[PDB]
Amino acid sequence: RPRFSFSIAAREGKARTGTIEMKRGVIRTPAFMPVGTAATVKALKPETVRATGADIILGNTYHLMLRPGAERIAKLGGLHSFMGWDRPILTDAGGYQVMSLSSLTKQSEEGVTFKSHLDGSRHMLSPERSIEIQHLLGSDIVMAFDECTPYPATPSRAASSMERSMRWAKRSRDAFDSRKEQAENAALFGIQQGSVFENLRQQSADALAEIGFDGYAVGGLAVGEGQDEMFRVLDFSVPMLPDDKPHYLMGVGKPDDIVGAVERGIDMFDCVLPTRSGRNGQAFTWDGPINIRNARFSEDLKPLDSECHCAVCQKWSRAYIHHLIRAGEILGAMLMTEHNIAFYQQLMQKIRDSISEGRFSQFAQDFRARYF
Amino acid sequence: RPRFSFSIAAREGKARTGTIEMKRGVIRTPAFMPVGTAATVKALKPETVRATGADIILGNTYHLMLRPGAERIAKLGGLHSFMGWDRPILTDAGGYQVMSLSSLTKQSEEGVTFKSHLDGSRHMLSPERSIEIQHLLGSDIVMAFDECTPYPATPSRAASSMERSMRWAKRSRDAFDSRKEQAENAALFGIQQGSVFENLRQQSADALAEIGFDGYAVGGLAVGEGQDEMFRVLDFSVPMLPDDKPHYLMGVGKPDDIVGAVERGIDMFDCVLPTRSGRNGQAFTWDGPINIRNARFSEDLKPLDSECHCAVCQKWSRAYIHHLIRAGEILGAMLMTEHNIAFYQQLMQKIRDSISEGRFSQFAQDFRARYF
Ligand SMILES: NCc1c[nH]c2nc(N)[nH]c(=O)c12
Ligand SMILES: NCc1c[nH]c2nc(N)[nH]c(=O)c12
Ligand SMILES: [Zn+2]
Ligand SMILES: [Zn+2]
């Protein structure tokens, strides 16, 4: 396979379905990427993550730089070898978790300085250091280091943060290109900023396209603005990005948000919702989410979802998983998480299939009717 | 298969190797039974428990009667169906956990009354109720309800507790037999008591044999007396039990204790050590246990054990599992537990094979040399 190749097989409105070929594997789009925070998709062996249908997972740079360390992981052979996942891995730049997980956060044009939450140690992170850490991890899709904008944001602060992000996007690009092995085996995605302002989103898209990237993320959304506003911003923001490259919406994972985002041109998604809420007792179904801890499931012999094809729904009942979760049992988290991630992959499959068959708008309509 | 059939294929000294045929499956002895406390072998799917080589698991009656309840489990189809384990399940009587997990413990000749630790509710447990609960669970090997003796114990208190246990053994036998479905599909094991006193152990063995059981457990050991004392008691206690029936040592699980116990005539074992210490960071190896949390394993690329055939040792390094455990990750517990239980099953296999080949004493000698 090539270093990176994105091809669109079918379209319907703004929605697209296709594939991204990379050295470690093929990624079917629209894609949902399970999150493996500290070198692990919580409560799941990587073979199970693959069994659910995932083509690629996401790795948190911020968490890995702290524990077990980027240099350590490189010495051990890289992230793939370390955790046992041999397919593509997209890594974020780490700055987003710094702005809300660490202390000291002394920000500047060079980068960010911070204190670790689990040690109180001192760390510096810049566009160059971020790209280097992702390289040490052996990341397949490297994210440019940016500065997120807090919601709500004034036109002035959003403009300043966006402009800085564009300068940092140029630095990330040059850093990535200067490392031969990385530029030849990995891919680099740029991140569009500009809060909820159209002119700013346009300036950001233009700067990013000028620099040139393998993919384009829509950053700064899903930060408290609500679905209506997020969708409104996507309406004018996605069309600004190069059409022939993947469009990645960062930190968006509610089933309904995914469907709406795909209708607006998004090809990639990631979120901890399926895993996090899985361990918390929330199970996704085609009839909407349910909290398995609720007493009405104590003697319910039906599977989490009546149509789900996952191993959990084939073998265990709601009553058993209800017991496991209320008893704080590890198997409860394992089962809930596997089902949720599988449900998400099945959602992506139904999306890819319906677009390929030119009946995606109807699928979205039917999905919503039943889900809500 | 028959309801119960124990056949000895080979012997060496007091050690025996053979099989127990039951309606749900065959049990190779000497056997080690993983513990599934609250309807789950902690951090493992039942298919994984089976993949490690386990022929049978143990279920805690005390925990299940509290949550989710015996009657509830019966309504749901039984324990096998409930947790997804279709092979034999041995269930304890529940009294042992009552004497050290609950409150109020008002003891009498009829049974025990207590307060649940997770609710503070009132529960009564007697030989009849215990047998009934195990029936509701759909248990394959039912344990007679007894009264354990605290270590150390005076000859007088040990005699009184043993005599009461023998009366309760008769009540358990009659209760088991009165339930047609249970007497025809399940097996009943009696429990020998008598602390560390020979004359008492003999009286207990005689009473048990008089009543007649499918198997005989050696109770009251591994309660703080030490290996030397435990072995000394087993030396004279096991020969007192009927030779043609299985000998089960309750709550004994250190690899070295197992080897010594088999040399003394024990055929069955159970303990939480492999699972409990697994989640705590202790991994068993042929070179003795190691605590994976120790810093010397942070960059150790070797598997938990150099010879282990388990899936964990085939796919992940000590460095990765070290990271997982220190990060409090669920996958850390899953991997450590699977390896430990697999290591235990491999130990039982090497024991069964060496006895079959008449070289068990040499295996025990070699095992100890390297393990210590
Ligand atoms: N929900 C938004 C989001 C999640 N992660 C992110 N990482 C970066 N660099 N930028 C972003 O905007 C975001
Ligand atoms: N270690 C001893 C032990 C564990 N579980 C037990 N259960 C019963 N009924 N009796 C016992 O002696 C024991
Ligand atoms: Zn499912
Ligand atoms: Zn192993």
JSON list of N, CA, C and O in Angstrom, two decimals, chain A residues 144 162 165-167 169-170 173 188-193 200-217 237-247:
[
{"chain": "A", "resi": 144, "resn": "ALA", "atom": "N", "xyz": [-1.36, 18.07, 13.48]},
{"chain": "A", "resi": 144, "resn": "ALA", "atom": "CA", "xyz": [-0.59, 19.29, 13.66]},
{"chain": "A", "resi": 144, "resn": "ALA", "atom": "C", "xyz": [-0.90, 19.84, 15.06]},
{"chain": "A", "resi": 144, "resn": "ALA", "atom": "O", "xyz": [-2.00, 19.64, 15.58]},
{"chain": "A", "resi": 162, "resn": "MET", "atom": "N", "xyz": [-6.77, 31.37, 16.24]},
{"chain": "A", "resi": 162, "resn": "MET", "atom": "CA", "xyz": [-6.77, 30.76, 14.91]},
{"chain": "A", "resi": 162, "resn": "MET", "atom": "C", "xyz": [-5.47, 31.11, 14.17]},
{"chain": "A", "resi": 162, "resn": "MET", "atom": "O", "xyz": [-4.81, 30.23, 13.63]},
{"chain": "A", "resi": 165, "resn": "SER", "atom": "N", "xyz": [-2.66, 29.22, 15.54]},
{"chain": "A", "resi": 165, "resn": "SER", "atom": "CA", "xyz": [-2.79, 27.82, 15.13]},
{"chain": "A", "resi": 165, "resn": "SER", "atom": "C", "xyz": [-2.28, 27.63, 13.71]},
{"chain": "A", "resi": 165, "resn": "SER", "atom": "O", "xyz": [-1.71, 26.59, 13.39]},
{"chain": "A", "resi": 166, "resn": "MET", "atom": "N", "xyz": [-2.49, 28.63, 12.86]},
{"chain": "A", "resi": 166, "resn": "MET", "atom": "CA", "xyz": [-2.04, 28.55, 11.48]},
{"chain": "A", "resi": 166, "resn": "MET", "atom": "C", "xyz": [-0.52, 28.67, 11.39]},
{"chain": "A", "resi": 166, "resn": "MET", "atom": "O", "xyz": [0.10, 28.05, 10.52]},
{"chain": "A", "resi": 167, "resn": "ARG", "atom": "N", "xyz": [0.08, 29.44, 12.30]},
{"chain": "A", "resi": 167, "resn": "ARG", "atom": "CA", "xyz": [1.53, 29.59, 12.32]},
{"chain": "A", "resi": 167, "resn": "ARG", "atom": "C", "xyz": [2.11, 28.26, 12.83]},
{"chain": "A", "resi": 167, "resn": "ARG", "atom": "O", "xyz": [3.10, 27.75, 12.31]},
{"chain": "A", "resi": 169, "resn": "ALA", "atom": "N", "xyz": [0.65, 25.46, 12.48]},
{"chain": "A", "resi": 169, "resn": "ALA", "atom": "CA", "xyz": [0.37, 24.46, 11.45]},
{"chain": "A", "resi": 169, "resn": "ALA", "atom": "C", "xyz": [1.53, 24.43, 10.45]},
{"chain": "A", "resi": 169, "resn": "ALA", "atom": "O", "xyz": [1.90, 23.37, 9.94]},
{"chain": "A", "resi": 170, "resn": "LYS", "atom": "N", "xyz": [2.11, 25.60, 10.19]},
{"chain": "A", "resi": 170, "resn": "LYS", "atom": "CA", "xyz": [3.24, 25.71, 9.27]},
{"chain": "A", "resi": 170, "resn": "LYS", "atom": "C", "xyz": [4.47, 25.07, 9.92]},
{"chain": "A", "resi": 170, "resn": "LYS", "atom": "O", "xyz": [5.22, 24.34, 9.27]},
{"chain": "A", "resi": 173, "resn": "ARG", "atom": "N", "xyz": [4.09, 21.26, 9.86]},
{"chain": "A", "resi": 173, "resn": "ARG", "atom": "CA", "xyz": [4.36, 20.79, 8.50]},
{"chain": "A", "resi": 173, "resn": "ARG", "atom": "C", "xyz": [5.86, 20.70, 8.24]},
{"chain": "A", "resi": 173, "resn": "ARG", "atom": "O", "xyz": [6.35, 19.66, 7.80]},
{"chain": "A", "resi": 188, "resn": "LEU", "atom": "N", "xyz": [0.11, 13.65, 7.59]},
{"chain": "A", "resi": 188, "resn": "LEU", "atom": "CA", "xyz": [-0.06, 14.81, 8.45]},
{"chain": "A", "resi": 188, "resn": "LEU", "atom": "C", "xyz": [-1.38, 15.53, 8.18]},
{"chain": "A", "resi": 188, "resn": "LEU", "atom": "O", "xyz": [-1.64, 15.94, 7.05]},
{"chain": "A", "resi": 189, "resn": "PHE", "atom": "N", "xyz": [-2.19, 15.69, 9.22]},
{"chain": "A", "resi": 189, "resn": "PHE", "atom": "CA", "xyz": [-3.47, 16.39, 9.12]},
{"chain": "A", "resi": 189, "resn": "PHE", "atom": "C", "xyz": [-3.36, 17.79, 9.74]},
{"chain": "A", "resi": 189, "resn": "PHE", "atom": "O", "xyz": [-2.72, 17.96, 10.78]},
{"chain": "A", "resi": 190, "resn": "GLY", "atom": "N", "xyz": [-3.98, 18.78, 9.09]},
{"chain": "A", "resi": 190, "resn": "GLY", "atom": "CA", "xyz": [-3.99, 20.14, 9.60]},
{"chain": "A", "resi": 190, "resn": "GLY", "atom": "C", "xyz": [-5.31, 20.34, 10.31]},
{"chain": "A", "resi": 190, "resn": "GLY", "atom": "O", "xyz": [-6.27, 19.60, 10.04]},
{"chain": "A", "resi": 191, "resn": "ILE", "atom": "N", "xyz": [-5.40, 21.30, 11.23]},
{"chain": "A", "resi": 191, "resn": "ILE", "atom": "CA", "xyz": [-6.65, 21.53, 11.95]},
{"chain": "A", "resi": 191, "resn": "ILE", "atom": "C", "xyz": [-7.24, 22.93, 11.75]},
{"chain": "A", "resi": 191, "resn": "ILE", "atom": "O", "xyz": [-6.58, 23.94, 12.02]},
{"chain": "A", "resi": 192, "resn": "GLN", "atom": "N", "xyz": [-8.47, 22.98, 11.26]},
{"chain": "A", "resi": 192, "resn": "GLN", "atom": "CA", "xyz": [-9.15, 24.26, 11.04]},
{"chain": "A", "resi": 192, "resn": "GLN", "atom": "C", "xyz": [-9.70, 24.79, 12.37]},
{"chain": "A", "resi": 192, "resn": "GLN", "atom": "O", "xyz": [-10.28, 24.04, 13.17]},
{"chain": "A", "resi": 193, "resn": "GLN", "atom": "N", "xyz": [-9.49, 26.08, 12.61]},
{"chain": "A", "resi": 193, "resn": "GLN", "atom": "CA", "xyz": [-9.99, 26.73, 13.83]},
{"chain": "A", "resi": 193, "resn": "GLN", "atom": "C", "xyz": [-10.84, 27.92, 13.40]},
{"chain": "A", "resi": 193, "resn": "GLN", "atom": "O", "xyz": [-11.20, 28.03, 12.23]},
{"chain": "A", "resi": 200, "resn": "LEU", "atom": "N", "xyz": [-13.45, 33.66, 9.80]},
{"chain": "A", "resi": 200, "resn": "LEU", "atom": "CA", "xyz": [-12.28, 33.08, 10.46]},
{"chain": "A", "resi": 200, "resn": "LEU", "atom": "C", "xyz": [-12.03, 31.65, 9.99]},
{"chain": "A", "resi": 200, "resn": "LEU", "atom": "O", "xyz": [-10.89, 31.24, 9.79]},
{"chain": "A", "resi": 201, "resn": "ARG", "atom": "N", "xyz": [-13.12, 30.88, 9.84]},
{"chain": "A", "resi": 201, "resn": "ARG", "atom": "CA", "xyz": [-13.05, 29.51, 9.37]},
{"chain": "A", "resi": 201, "resn": "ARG", "atom": "C", "xyz": [-12.49, 29.50, 7.95]},
{"chain": "A", "resi": 201, "resn": "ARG", "atom": "O", "xyz": [-11.68, 28.64, 7.60]},
{"chain": "A", "resi": 202, "resn": "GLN", "atom": "N", "xyz": [-12.91, 30.48, 7.15]},
{"chain": "A", "resi": 202, "resn": "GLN", "atom": "CA", "xyz": [-12.45, 30.62, 5.77]},
{"chain": "A", "resi": 202, "resn": "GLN", "atom": "C", "xyz": [-10.96, 30.94, 5.73]},
{"chain": "A", "resi": 202, "resn": "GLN", "atom": "O", "xyz": [-10.22, 30.35, 4.95]},
{"chain": "A", "resi": 203, "resn": "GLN", "atom": "N", "xyz": [-10.52, 31.89, 6.55]},
{"chain": "A", "resi": 203, "resn": "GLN", "atom": "CA", "xyz": [-9.11, 32.25, 6.59]},
{"chain": "A", "resi": 203, "resn": "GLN", "atom": "C", "xyz": [-8.28, 31.04, 7.00]},
{"chain": "A", "resi": 203, "resn": "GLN", "atom": "O", "xyz": [-7.24, 30.77, 6.42]},
{"chain": "A", "resi": 204, "resn": "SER", "atom": "N", "xyz": [-8.79, 30.29, 7.98]},
{"chain": "A", "resi": 204, "resn": "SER", "atom": "CA", "xyz": [-8.11, 29.09, 8.47]},
{"chain": "A", "resi": 204, "resn": "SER", "atom": "C", "xyz": [-8.01, 28.04, 7.37]},
{"chain": "A", "resi": 204, "resn": "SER", "atom": "O", "xyz": [-6.93, 27.48, 7.13]},
{"chain": "A", "resi": 205, "resn": "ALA", "atom": "N", "xyz": [-9.12, 27.79, 6.68]},
{"chain": "A", "resi": 205, "resn": "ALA", "atom": "CA", "xyz": [-9.15, 26.80, 5.59]},
{"chain": "A", "resi": 205, "resn": "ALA", "atom": "C", "xyz": [-8.16, 27.18, 4.49]},
{"chain": "A", "resi": 205, "resn": "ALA", "atom": "O", "xyz": [-7.45, 26.32, 3.97]},
{"chain": "A", "resi": 206, "resn": "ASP", "atom": "N", "xyz": [-8.11, 28.47, 4.14]},
{"chain": "A", "resi": 206, "resn": "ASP", "atom": "CA", "xyz": [-7.20, 28.96, 3.11]},
{"chain": "A", "resi": 206, "resn": "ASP", "atom": "C", "xyz": [-5.74, 28.77, 3.51]},
{"chain": "A", "resi": 206, "resn": "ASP", "atom": "O", "xyz": [-4.92, 28.35, 2.70]},
{"chain": "A", "resi": 207, "resn": "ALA", "atom": "N", "xyz": [-5.40, 29.09, 4.76]},
{"chain": "A", "resi": 207, "resn": "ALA", "atom": "CA", "xyz": [-4.03, 28.95, 5.25]},
{"chain": "A", "resi": 207, "resn": "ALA", "atom": "C", "xyz": [-3.59, 27.49, 5.22]},
{"chain": "A", "resi": 207, "resn": "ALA", "atom": "O", "xyz": [-2.48, 27.17, 4.80]},
{"chain": "A", "resi": 208, "resn": "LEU", "atom": "N", "xyz": [-4.48, 26.61, 5.67]},
{"chain": "A", "resi": 208, "resn": "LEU", "atom": "CA", "xyz": [-4.24, 25.17, 5.72]},
{"chain": "A", "resi": 208, "resn": "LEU", "atom": "C", "xyz": [-4.02, 24.59, 4.33]},
{"chain": "A", "resi": 208, "resn": "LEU", "atom": "O", "xyz": [-3.10, 23.81, 4.12]},
{"chain": "A", "resi": 209, "resn": "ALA", "atom": "N", "xyz": [-4.88, 24.97, 3.38]},
{"chain": "A", "resi": 209, "resn": "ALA", "atom": "CA", "xyz": [-4.79, 24.49, 2.01]},
{"chain": "A", "resi": 209, "resn": "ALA", "atom": "C", "xyz": [-3.51, 25.02, 1.36]},
{"chain": "A", "resi": 209, "resn": "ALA", "atom": "O", "xyz": [-2.87, 24.33, 0.57]},
{"chain": "A", "resi": 210, "resn": "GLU", "atom": "N", "xyz": [-3.14, 26.25, 1.73]},
{"chain": "A", "resi": 210, "resn": "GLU", "atom": "CA", "xyz": [-1.93, 26.88, 1.20]},
{"chain": "A", "resi": 210, "resn": "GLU", "atom": "C", "xyz": [-0.71, 26.05, 1.61]},
{"chain": "A", "resi": 210, "resn": "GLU", "atom": "O", "xyz": [0.15, 25.75, 0.78]},
{"chain": "A", "resi": 211, "resn": "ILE", "atom": "N", "xyz": [-0.66, 25.68, 2.88]},
{"chain": "A", "resi": 211, "resn": "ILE", "atom": "CA", "xyz": [0.43, 24.86, 3.41]},
{"chain": "A", "resi": 211, "resn": "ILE", "atom": "C", "xyz": [0.34, 23.46, 2.77]},
{"chain": "A", "resi": 211, "resn": "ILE", "atom": "O", "xyz": [1.34, 22.93, 2.28]},
{"chain": "A", "resi": 212, "resn": "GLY", "atom": "N", "xyz": [-0.86, 22.89, 2.76]},
{"chain": "A", "resi": 212, "resn": "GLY", "atom": "CA", "xyz": [-1.06, 21.58, 2.18]},
{"chain": "A", "resi": 212, "resn": "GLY", "atom": "C", "xyz": [-0.90, 20.46, 3.18]},
{"chain": "A", "resi": 212, "resn": "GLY", "atom": "O", "xyz": [0.15, 20.32, 3.80]},
{"chain": "A", "resi": 213, "resn": "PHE", "atom": "N", "xyz": [-1.96, 19.67, 3.34]},
{"chain": "A", "resi": 213, "resn": "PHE", "atom": "CA", "xyz": [-1.98, 18.54, 4.27]},
{"chain": "A", "resi": 213, "resn": "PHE", "atom": "C", "xyz": [-2.65, 17.33, 3.63]},
{"chain": "A", "resi": 213, "resn": "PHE", "atom": "O", "xyz": [-3.31, 17.44, 2.60]},
{"chain": "A", "resi": 214, "resn": "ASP", "atom": "N", "xyz": [-2.46, 16.17, 4.25]},
{"chain": "A", "resi": 214, "resn": "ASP", "atom": "CA", "xyz": [-3.03, 14.92, 3.77]},
{"chain": "A", "resi": 214, "resn": "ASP", "atom": "C", "xyz": [-4.50, 14.81, 4.15]},
{"chain": "A", "resi": 214, "resn": "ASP", "atom": "O", "xyz": [-5.26, 14.09, 3.51]},
{"chain": "A", "resi": 215, "resn": "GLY", "atom": "N", "xyz": [-4.87, 15.54, 5.20]},
{"chain": "A", "resi": 215, "resn": "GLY", "atom": "CA", "xyz": [-6.24, 15.54, 5.68]},
{"chain": "A", "resi": 215, "resn": "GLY", "atom": "C", "xyz": [-6.50, 16.82, 6.45]},
{"chain": "A", "resi": 215, "resn": "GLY", "atom": "O", "xyz": [-5.57, 17.51, 6.87]},
{"chain": "A", "resi": 216, "resn": "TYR", "atom": "N", "xyz": [-7.78, 17.13, 6.65]},
{"chain": "A", "resi": 216, "resn": "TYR", "atom": "CA", "xyz": [-8.17, 18.34, 7.35]},
{"chain": "A", "resi": 216, "resn": "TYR", "atom": "C", "xyz": [-9.22, 18.11, 8.43]},
{"chain": "A", "resi": 216, "resn": "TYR", "atom": "O", "xyz": [-10.32, 17.63, 8.16]},
{"chain": "A", "resi": 217, "resn": "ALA", "atom": "N", "xyz": [-8.86, 18.47, 9.65]},
{"chain": "A", "resi": 217, "resn": "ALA", "atom": "CA", "xyz": [-9.76, 18.33, 10.77]},
{"chain": "A", "resi": 217, "resn": "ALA", "atom": "C", "xyz": [-10.50, 19.64, 11.02]},
{"chain": "A", "resi": 217, "resn": "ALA", "atom": "O", "xyz": [-10.03, 20.71, 10.65]},
{"chain": "A", "resi": 237, "resn": "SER", "atom": "N", "xyz": [-18.33, 25.46, 7.14]},
{"chain": "A", "resi": 237, "resn": "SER", "atom": "CA", "xyz": [-16.92, 25.12, 7.34]},
{"chain": "A", "resi": 237, "resn": "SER", "atom": "C", "xyz": [-16.35, 23.96, 6.51]},
{"chain": "A", "resi": 237, "resn": "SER", "atom": "O", "xyz": [-15.24, 24.05, 5.97]},
{"chain": "A", "resi": 238, "resn": "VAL", "atom": "N", "xyz": [-17.09, 22.85, 6.42]},
{"chain": "A", "resi": 238, "resn": "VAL", "atom": "CA", "xyz": [-16.60, 21.70, 5.66]},
{"chain": "A", "resi": 238, "resn": "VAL", "atom": "C", "xyz": [-16.39, 22.00, 4.16]},
{"chain": "A", "resi": 238, "resn": "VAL", "atom": "O", "xyz": [-15.39, 21.59, 3.58]},
{"chain": "A", "resi": 239, "resn": "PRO", "atom": "N", "xyz": [-17.33, 22.73, 3.52]},
{"chain": "A", "resi": 239, "resn": "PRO", "atom": "CA", "xyz": [-17.17, 23.06, 2.09]},
{"chain": "A", "resi": 239, "resn": "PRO", "atom": "C", "xyz": [-15.90, 23.89, 1.80]},
{"chain": "A", "resi": 239, "resn": "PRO", "atom": "O", "xyz": [-15.45, 23.96, 0.66]},
{"chain": "A", "resi": 240, "resn": "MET", "atom": "N", "xyz": [-15.34, 24.52, 2.83]},
{"chain": "A", "resi": 240, "resn": "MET", "atom": "CA", "xyz": [-14.13, 25.34, 2.70]},
{"chain": "A", "resi": 240, "resn": "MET", "atom": "C", "xyz": [-12.87, 24.48, 2.59]},
{"chain": "A", "resi": 240, "resn": "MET", "atom": "O", "xyz": [-11.84, 24.92, 2.08]},
{"chain": "A", "resi": 241, "resn": "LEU", "atom": "N", "xyz": [-12.94, 23.26, 3.11]},
{"chain": "A", "resi": 241, "resn": "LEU", "atom": "CA", "xyz": [-11.80, 22.35, 3.10]},
{"chain": "A", "resi": 241, "resn": "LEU", "atom": "C", "xyz": [-11.66, 21.67, 1.73]},
{"chain": "A", "resi": 241, "resn": "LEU", "atom": "O", "xyz": [-12.65, 21.56, 1.00]},
{"chain": "A", "resi": 242, "resn": "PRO", "atom": "N", "xyz": [-10.43, 21.27, 1.36]},
{"chain": "A", "resi": 242, "resn": "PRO", "atom": "CA", "xyz": [-10.22, 20.60, 0.07]},
{"chain": "A", "resi": 242, "resn": "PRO", "atom": "C", "xyz": [-11.11, 19.37, 0.03]},
{"chain": "A", "resi": 242, "resn": "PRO", "atom": "O", "xyz": [-11.11, 18.56, 0.95]},
{"chain": "A", "resi": 243, "resn": "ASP", "atom": "N", "xyz": [-11.90, 19.26, -1.03]},
{"chain": "A", "resi": 243, "resn": "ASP", "atom": "CA", "xyz": [-12.83, 18.16, -1.21]},
{"chain": "A", "resi": 243, "resn": "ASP", "atom": "C", "xyz": [-12.20, 16.78, -1.38]},
{"chain": "A", "resi": 243, "resn": "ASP", "atom": "O", "xyz": [-12.74, 15.78, -0.90]},
{"chain": "A", "resi": 244, "resn": "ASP", "atom": "N", "xyz": [-11.04, 16.72, -2.02]},
{"chain": "A", "resi": 244, "resn": "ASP", "atom": "CA", "xyz": [-10.36, 15.46, -2.27]},
{"chain": "A", "resi": 244, "resn": "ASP", "atom": "C", "xyz": [-9.52, 14.90, -1.12]},
{"chain": "A", "resi": 244, "resn": "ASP", "atom": "O", "xyz": [-8.75, 13.95, -1.32]},
{"chain": "A", "resi": 245, "resn": "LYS", "atom": "N", "xyz": [-9.64, 15.49, 0.06]},
{"chain": "A", "resi": 245, "resn": "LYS", "atom": "CA", "xyz": [-8.89, 15.02, 1.23]},
{"chain": "A", "resi": 245, "resn": "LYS", "atom": "C", "xyz": [-9.87, 14.70, 2.36]},
{"chain": "A", "resi": 245, "resn": "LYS", "atom": "O", "xyz": [-10.97, 15.25, 2.40]},
{"chain": "A", "resi": 246, "resn": "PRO", "atom": "N", "xyz": [-9.50, 13.79, 3.27]},
{"chain": "A", "resi": 246, "resn": "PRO", "atom": "CA", "xyz": [-10.40, 13.44, 4.38]},
{"chain": "A", "resi": 246, "resn": "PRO", "atom": "C", "xyz": [-10.74, 14.63, 5.29]},
{"chain": "A", "resi": 246, "resn": "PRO", "atom": "O", "xyz": [-9.91, 15.52, 5.50]},
{"chain": "A", "resi": 247, "resn": "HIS", "atom": "N", "xyz": [-11.97, 14.65, 5.80]},
{"chain": "A", "resi": 247, "resn": "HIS", "atom": "CA", "xyz": [-12.47, 15.69, 6.71]},
{"chain": "A", "resi": 247, "resn": "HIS", "atom": "C", "xyz": [-12.72, 15.00, 8.04]},
{"chain": "A", "resi": 247, "resn": "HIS", "atom": "O", "xyz": [-13.58, 14.13, 8.15]}
]
